[PDB]
Design a protein around this ligand. Structure first.
Ligand code: 3ES
Ligand code: 3ES
Ligand SMILES: *[C@@H]1O[C@H](CO[C@@H]2O[C@@H](C)[C@@H](O)[C@@H](O)[C@@H]2O)[C@@H](O[C@@H]2O[C@H](CO)[C@@H](O[C@@H]3O[C@H](CO)[C@@H](O)[C@H](O)[C@@H]3O)[C@H](O)[C@H]2NC(C)=O)[C@H](O)[C@H]1NC(C)=O
Ligand code: NAG
Ligand code: CL
Ligand code: CL
Ligand code: ZN
Length: 581
C-alpha cells in the first residue's frame, strides 16, 4: 500500500528527528567530557535509540520495497529495514555498545610515558614527534610506544567486537559486517572498481616510493635503508605512514627553491583555532556556499579543553538533526596540517547544511566518499602556493615540481593505505583472518600495498591495527580511498566551471560562484538519488575515475621517472623480506 508507506515514512521522520537529536547530544556530551556520568547517560540513550530503531525497522520490514512506486519513499524504507546493531538481542546489544564504548575510550585516553614520569598524548605530542623528529631512535620510541599502549589495549575487545558486528549484519540480511559495509555503495562491481583504480595509481606510487626511499637512504644512512626493500614504517612523518608531507624537507626536489616554515608563520602572525575555522568559513562563502550558523561558534569544541576535561580529540563533524545545530569537535593545533583538517571538517558541515531540509533518512552523502571529498576539494585550492601567499604564509617549473611533490606526499601515498585498511577488515569480517592472524595479516598488507616494514619485530599480543583510530571506533575506511579518487574529479570539474585553463594543479577555485553552485546542487540531493547521478551533476560523467588525479600529477610522474631512472632505482621492493638489522 503506497499511502500507508508514505504515512509510515512521515511518522518515521517526525520521531527520528527527536530521537537522533537526543542521541547526538548525549554522544557529544560524552565525546567532549569523558566521565562516569556522561558514559551512563550515553549508554541509556543507546537503549532509547535501539528501541526506536527496532520499532520502526520492524514496521519497515512489512513493506515490499519492490512493490512501491515512489523512489524517494522506496529508498527511505529500504534504509530503515536495516536495524544495524538494534537487530541484536537485548544482552548482545548491551555487550556490543559497551565494547564500542570501551574500545573508543581506551584509544582516546592512551598515553606513552618515559622512565621519569613524562607522559605524551597522541594529539598533539606524539603527532608532533612523528612530524618533526629526524632522529631514528626518537621516531622509533613514539611509533613503538603508541602501539604498545594503544594497540595492545584494544586486542582484548576485538574478537567479541567482530562476533557481534557480524551477528548484527547477518540479522539484517548480510553475510558479514564487511558485506554490509560494501553494500552501502549500492554498486555490484565495487571491489573490482576499487582494484582497477588502485592499479592505475601504481606507476605514480611506485615512483614516489622509490624516490622517497632514496631520500631516506640519504638522511638516515645506507646501513638503515635497503634501496631494494620496504621502507621502515616510522620514517614517513606520520604515525601510520599514511600521508608523508611532513618529511617534505627531506625529499624536496629543488632545494634551491625554499619555502618558509608555515607553522612559524601561522603562530607569529596570530593564527588561532577560531581564526583557522573562520578562514575555512570565508573560503566556503567565497564560493557562494553557506556560512556556518552563529550557533556553530557558540557550541563547537575547536580546541582541546584546558578545563581538566578528558575528550576524544580525533576530528569529527556533528549533525544534531534539527536543521539548525551543527558542530565540529577538534583538538586543533595551529599549523598548516590542521588548517587542511579544519577545511575537511567544514566540508562535512557544509554538506549537513545543504541537505538539512531533506527527511532524516536521506541526510547523508550521495555515498560516504562524497561526504569526505567536499572539504578536501576546497583544501586542494587552499594549499596552492598562490592561495598560501595571499594568506602571507609563503612569500618556474622547479617551483611546480616542488609543489606537486608536497601534494603527492599526501595524496598519492594515502592511496595504498586507504585501500588496505578495509581489505584487512573485510577479511576479518568474513573469517579469512582470525585473532591468531590479526597482526601478521595486517603487516602482509602493509608490505604488499604500501611497501613498508615494521622497524622492530612484532611480538605476541601486538595489535597494531588497534593503534589506528578507525579500528576501535569502528569507522569504515574505504570512504577515504573513494574520497581521494573523486576529489580530483571534482577539482577538475569545478576548475573547468571556474574557467581555468592549463595545468590542473595551478587551479585555485577561490571566489568561483560557478564552482560553488556545481557542488551545492549535488550536496542538496543528500542520499535521495543513487550516487552516479550526483557524480554526473558535478563532473558530466557517472563513474569513479582515476583520470583527473593522474592528470593533476602528470608532470610529477614524468619528473619522477626520469629522476629514478638516473639513479637506477628498482621500482617496488624485490627484497620484500628485508627488515632493519
Ligand atoms: O557510517 C556509519 N553508518 C552509516 C551507514 C554505513 C555503514 C557502513 C559503511 C558505510 C555507511 P548510517 O547508519 O548513516 C550512519 C548514521 C549517521 C551518522 C552519524 C555520524 C557521525 C559522525 C561523526 C560524529 C558523530 C556522528 N556518521 O554517520 C548513524 O550512525 N546513525 C545512528 C544515529 C546517530 C546520530 C547521531 C550521532 O552522533 C550518532 C549516531 C543510528 O542509526 O543509530 O557507521 C560509522 C560510524 C561509526 C561511529 C560513529 C558514527 C558512524
Ligand atoms: O566527522 C566525520 N568523520 C571523521 C571520523 C569519525 C567518524 C565517525 C565517528 C567519529 C569520527 P573524519 O573522517 O572527518 C576525521 C579525519 C578527517 C581528516 C584528516 C585529515 C588529515 C590530513 C592530513 C594530515 C592529517 C590529517 N584531513 O581530514 C579522519 O579521520 N581522516 C582519516 C582519513 C583521511 C586522511 C587524510 C586526509 O587528507 C583525509 C582523510 C584519517 O585521519 O585517517 O564524519 C562526519 C559525517 C557525518 C555523517 C555522514 C558523513 C560524515
Ligand atoms: C515521491 O515523493 C516525494 C516525497 O514526497 C514527500 O514525502 C511524502 C512521504 C509525503 O509526505 C508527501 O506529501 C511529500 O511531498 C516527492 O518529492 C517532493 O516533491 C514535492 C513537489 O515537487 C517537493 O515540493 C517542493 O518544495 C519546494 C520547497 O518547499 C518548492 O520550491 C517546490 O515548488 C515544491 O513544492 C518536495 O520538496 C519533494 N520532497 C522530497 C523529499 O523530495 C516526489 O515528488 C514524489 N515523486 C513522484 C513521482 O510523485
Ligand atoms: C562533565 O561532566 C560532569 C559529570 O560527570 C559534570 O559535572 C560537568 O559539568 C561536566 N563538565 C563540563 C565542563 O561541562
Ligand atoms: Cl601499524
Ligand atoms: Cl565507507
Ligand atoms: Zn571526514
Amino acid at each position: 500500500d503506497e499511502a500507508e508507506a508514505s504515512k509510515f515514512v512521515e511518522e518515521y521522520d517526525r520521531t527520528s528527528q527527536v530521537v537522533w537529536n537526543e542521541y547526538a547530544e548525549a554522544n557529544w556530551n560524552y565525546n567532549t567530557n569523558i566521565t562516569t556520568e556522561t558514559s551512563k547517560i550515553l549508554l541509556q540513550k543507546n537503549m532509547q535509540i535501539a528501541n526506536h530503531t527496532l520499532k520502526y525497522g520492524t514496521q519497515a520490514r512489512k513493506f515490499d520495497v519492490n512493490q512501491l512506486q515512489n523512489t524517494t519513499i522506496k529508498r527511505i524504507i529500504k534504509k530503515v529495514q536495516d536495524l544495524e546493531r538494534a537487530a541484536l538481542p537485548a544482552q548482545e546489544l548491551e555487550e556490543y555498545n559497551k565494547i564500542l564504548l570501551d574500545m573508543e575510550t581506551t584509544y582516546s585516553v592512551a598515553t606513552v610515558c618515559h622512565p621519569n614520569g613524562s607522559c605524551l598524548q597522541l594529539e598533539p605530542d606524539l603527532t608532533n614527534v612523528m612530524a618533526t623528529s629526524r632522529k631514528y631512535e626518537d621516531l622509533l620510541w613514539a611509533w613503538e610506544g603508541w602501539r604498545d599502549k594503544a594497540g595492545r589495549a584494544i586486542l582484548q575487545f576485538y574478537p567479541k567486537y567482530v562476533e557481534l558486528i557480524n551477528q548484527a549484519a547477518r540479522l539484517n540480511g548480510y553475510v558479514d559486517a564487511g558485506d554490509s559495509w560494501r553494500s552501502m555503495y549500492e554498486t555490484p562491481s565495487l571491489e573490482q572498481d576499487l582494484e582497477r583504480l588502485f592499479q592505475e595509481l601504481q606507476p605514480l606510487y611506485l615512483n614516489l616510493h622509490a624516490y622517497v626511499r632514496r631520500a631516506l637512504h640519504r638522511h638516515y644512512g645506507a646501513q638503515h635503508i635497503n634501496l631494494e626493500g620496504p621502507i621502515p614504517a616510522h620514517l614517513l612523518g606520520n604515525m601510520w605512514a599514511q600521508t608523508w608531507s611532513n618529511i617534505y624537507d627531506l625529499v624536496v626536489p629543488f632545494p634551491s627553491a625554499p619555502s618558509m616554515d608555515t607553522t612559524e608563520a601561522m603562530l607569529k602572525q596570530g593564527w588561532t583555532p577560531r581564526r583557522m575555522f573562520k578562514e575555512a568559513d570565508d573560503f566556503f562563502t567565497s564560493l557562494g556556499l553557506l556560512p556556518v550558523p552563529p550557533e556553530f561558534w557558540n557550541k563547537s569544541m575547536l580546541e582541546k579543553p584546558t578545563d581538566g576535561r578528558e575528550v576524544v580529540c580525533h576530528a569529527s563533524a556533528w549533525d544534531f538533526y534539527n536543521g539548525k545545530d551543527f558542530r565540529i569537535k577538534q583538538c586543533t593545533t595551529v599549523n598548516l596540517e590542521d588548517l587542511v583538517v579544519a577545511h575537511h571538517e567544514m566540508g562535512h558541515i557544509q554538506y549537513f547544511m545543504q541537505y538539512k531540509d531533506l527527511p532524516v533518512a536521506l541526510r547523508e552523502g550521495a555515498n560516504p566518499g562524497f561526504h569526505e571529498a567536499i572539504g578536501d576539494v576546497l583544501a586542494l585550492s587552499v594549499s596552492t602556493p598562490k592561495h598560501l601567499h595571499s594568506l602571507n604564509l609563503l612569500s618556474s617549473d622547479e617551483h611546480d615540481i616542488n609543489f606537486l611533490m608536497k601534494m603527492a606526499l599526501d595524496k598519492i601515498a594515502f592511496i595504498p593505505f586507504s585501500y588496505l585498511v578495509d581489505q584487512w577488515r573485510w577479511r576479518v569480517f568474513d573469517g579469512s583472518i582470525t585473532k591468531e592472524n590479526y597482526n601478521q595479516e595486517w603487516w602482509s598488507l602493509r608490505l604488499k600495498y604500501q611497501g613498508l616494514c615494521p622497524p622492530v619485530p612484532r611480538t605476541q599480543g601486538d595489535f597494531d591495527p588497534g593503534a589506528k583510530f578507525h579500528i576501535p571506533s569502528s569507522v569504515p575506511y574505504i570512504r577515504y580511498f573513494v574520497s581521494f579518487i573523486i576529489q580530483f574529479q571534482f577539482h577538475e570539474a569545478l576548475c573547468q566551471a571556474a574557467g581555468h585553463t592549463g595545468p590542473l594543479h595551478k587551479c585555485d577555485i577561490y571566489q568561483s560562484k560557478e564552482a560553488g553552485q556545481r557542488l551545492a546542487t549535488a550536496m542538496k540531493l543528500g542520499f535521495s538519488r543513487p550516487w552516479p547521478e550526483a557524480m554526473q551533476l558535478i563532473t558530466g560523467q557517472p563513474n569513479m575515475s582515476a583520470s583527473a588525479m593522474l592528470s593533476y600529477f602528470k608532470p610529477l610522474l614524468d619528473w619522477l621517472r626520469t629522476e629514478n631512472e638516473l639513479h637506477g632505482e628498482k621500482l617496488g621492493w624485490p627484497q620484500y623480506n628485508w627488515t632493519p638489522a
